[PDB]
């Protein structure tokens, strides 16, 4: 069936948010730096990988107001083993009601995509805001575009979409506004 | 790779 249940009473009216994960929210490498923000063990057929990740400027004041405004969804290409334990360290508000990772997307012409018709949401109820095109090929309409970061810290993304954000979670069809 | 290839 769907990759997410019913919404919870309280999100019901609420628009539903894909918000990706990697380059979008934060990055993380495995080459070593001093300033990360988490360092998380990946075990990888048997050896121990650490993954340094650096969070996006921002991303707290955003994930928190989203949280609050939508029906917040972590939707991401990467594995659990990675992405679980950053949302957890991630996400102290509770802003993400379920979380996908690379099994629940669908791979067509060698790229992972996030097929938003899997999720059993009114497509005009729901937005999705990742770092990278390819992510959103099905759904070009819902999209809502946010530039890929690696390290820049002097980078407000984040901060600038929130009023954009503010004004969309009023809206009864996003593609009133997304044009569609 | 574990992370968004
Ligand atoms: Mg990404």
Redesign the pocket.
Same mark, same amino acid.
């Given at each position: 069936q769907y990759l997410l249940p019913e919404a919870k009473a309280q999100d019901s009216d609420k628009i539903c948010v894909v918000i $990706?994960? &990697?380059?979008?929210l934060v990055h993380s490498s495995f080459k070593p730096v001093n300033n990360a923000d988490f360092i998380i063990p990946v075990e990888i057929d048997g050896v121990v990988h650490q993954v340094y990740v650096l969070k996006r400027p921002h991303v707290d004041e955003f994930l928190q107001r989203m949280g609050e405004l939508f029906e917040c969804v972590l939707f991401?290409?990467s594995l659990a083993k990675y992405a679980d334990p950053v949302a957890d360290l991630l996400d102290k508000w509770g802003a993400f009601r379920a979380r996908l990772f690379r099994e629940s997307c669908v791979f067509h012409r060698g790229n992972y995509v996030k097929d938003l018709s899997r999720l059993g949401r009114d497509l005009r109820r729901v937005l999705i805001l &990742? $770092? =990278?095109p390819a =992510?959103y090929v099905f759904h070009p309409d819902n999209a809502v575009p946010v530039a =890929?970061w690696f390290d820049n810290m002097s980078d407000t993304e984040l901060h600038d979409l929130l009023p954009f954000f503010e004004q969309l979670s009023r809206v009864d069809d996003v593609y009133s506004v997304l044009r569609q | 790779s574990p992370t968004?290839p």
């Open positions: $990706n994960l &990697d380059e979008t991401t290409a &990742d $770092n =990278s =992510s =890929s | 968004s």
